[PDB]
Structures are given as C-alpha cells and as structure tokens.
Amino acid sequence: MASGWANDDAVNEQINSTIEDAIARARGEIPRGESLDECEECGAPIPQARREAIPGVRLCIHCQQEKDLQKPAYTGYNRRGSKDSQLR
C-alpha cells in the first residue's frame, strides 16, 4: 500500500508554486501569469493566436488541437469556500 513512500512536506514545497513565484520576480523566467512562446512538448513556435485565445497556453497549434479534444468541457466539482474575487 502506497502510504508514506515518497509524499513528504519537505519535498512537496519544491512542487509548490512558491518556487516558480520566487523565480518569476527573481529573474523574470516565468511569464506574467500568461502564455509562453515555446511549446512544452516539442519546443515548437507558439503563435500569438493561441496566446490571446488561451490565457496561459503551453502547446503549439499542433500539440494544442489534439488536447483541445481531451478538454472535458465540465468540472462536476464541489469546492465549498469563499474568496476575494472582486474589484475593491
């Protein structure tokens, strides 16, 4: 039974977005919460078309069109909780 085999707190914090947020403001490696210009699959030229259509695209039009099919178009979720999602 896979329990206490690898999933630790002191290894999950590297996986946490704290690291990428630190590097984003440190050297400007990570973009401003938006799309990139190089496909994470095959390093292929990301078109501005995919960038402006999809806020945070990581797939060139070739690798994207196949995953666009695999997009569920639903959540079926239940995450009870309130947040600051406003403009004051």
Q: Which residues of the chain form contacts with Zn ion (CB under 5 A)?
A: 39, 41-42, 44, 60, 63
What the block records as the tokens of 77 is 């979720």
Query: Which is closer to Zn ion, CB of 57 or CB of 60?
Result: 60
Query: Which is closer to Zn ion, CB of 15 or CB of 49?
Result: 49
Query: Which is closer to Zn ion, CB of 71 or CB of 88?
Result: 71
Concatenating the DSSP letter of every residue in 6-21 gives S--HHHHHHHSTHHHH
Alpha carbon distance 67, 40 (integer Å): 13
Smallest distance from Zn ion to CB 30, Å: 19
